[PDB]
C-alpha cells in the first residue's frame, strides 16, 4: 500500500526512448558485428583449405560449428554489454531489470543491440532446402 501510493507521485513508464541508445553505442555494436562476420569468414576459409584441425572427440563439421558459434556468441555478448553500458540511470528497462521486477539483461541486449543466434534443435538453422537454408542464399553457405 505505501509504495503503491508513492508511485502515484513518482510514476513508472516504458517507452521508445528507453530502447534507443547513443549513436556511439550503435557504431560500436556495428563494428563488433563487422569484425565478427570477418572472423567467421576466416574460419570458413580455413575450413575450405582444410587447414582446420579437428578438436579431439569431434568431427571437423562439429568443430567448425563449435568455433563459429563461439565467435558469434562472443560478438553477441559484447554487443549486449555495449548496449547495457549505454543505459542511463533514468532508463526504465534498467529500472525493471535492476529491481528484478521483470526482464533480464538478455532482453535489454536483444531490444537494443542484437537479437542473437537463432538455434533449432541445438544447432544453427538447418539446411531445409537442398544445401541452403532459404532459396535466397547460395548453396553451401555456412556464413553468419
Amino acid at each position: 500500500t505505501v509504495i503503491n501510493n508513492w508511485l502515484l507521485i513518482e510514476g513508472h513508464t516504458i517507452g521508445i526512448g528507453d530502447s534507443i541508445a547513443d549513436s556511439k553505442t550503435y557504431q560500436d555494436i556495428q563494428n563488433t558485428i563487422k569484425k565478427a562476420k570477418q572472423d567467421v569468414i576466416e574460419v570458413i576459409e580455413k575450413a575450405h583449405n582444410n587447414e582446420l584441425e579437428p578438436t579431439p572427440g569431434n568431427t571437423l563439421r562439429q568443430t567448425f560449428e563449435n568455433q563459429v558459434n563461439r565467435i558469434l556468441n562472443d560478438a553477441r555478448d559484447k554487443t549486449g554489454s555495449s548496449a547495457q553500458k549505454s543505459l542511463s540511470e533514468y532508463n526504465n528497462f534498467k529500472s525493471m531489470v535492476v529491481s528484478g521486477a521483470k526482464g533480464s539483461k538478455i532482453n535489454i541486449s536483444q531490444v537494443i543491440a542484437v537479437v542473437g543466434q537463432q538455434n533449432v534443435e541445438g544447432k544453427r538453422i538447418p539446411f531445409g532446402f537442398k544445401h541452403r537454408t532459404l532459396p535466397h542464399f547460395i548453396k553451401d553457405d555456412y556464413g553468419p
Binding site: 558459434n69 558469434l72 543466434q117 538455434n119
Partner: peptide, 8 residues
Amino acid sequence: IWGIGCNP
C-alpha cells in the same frame, strides 16, 4: 532466439 547455450 539468443544463442546455442541460451534459449532458442
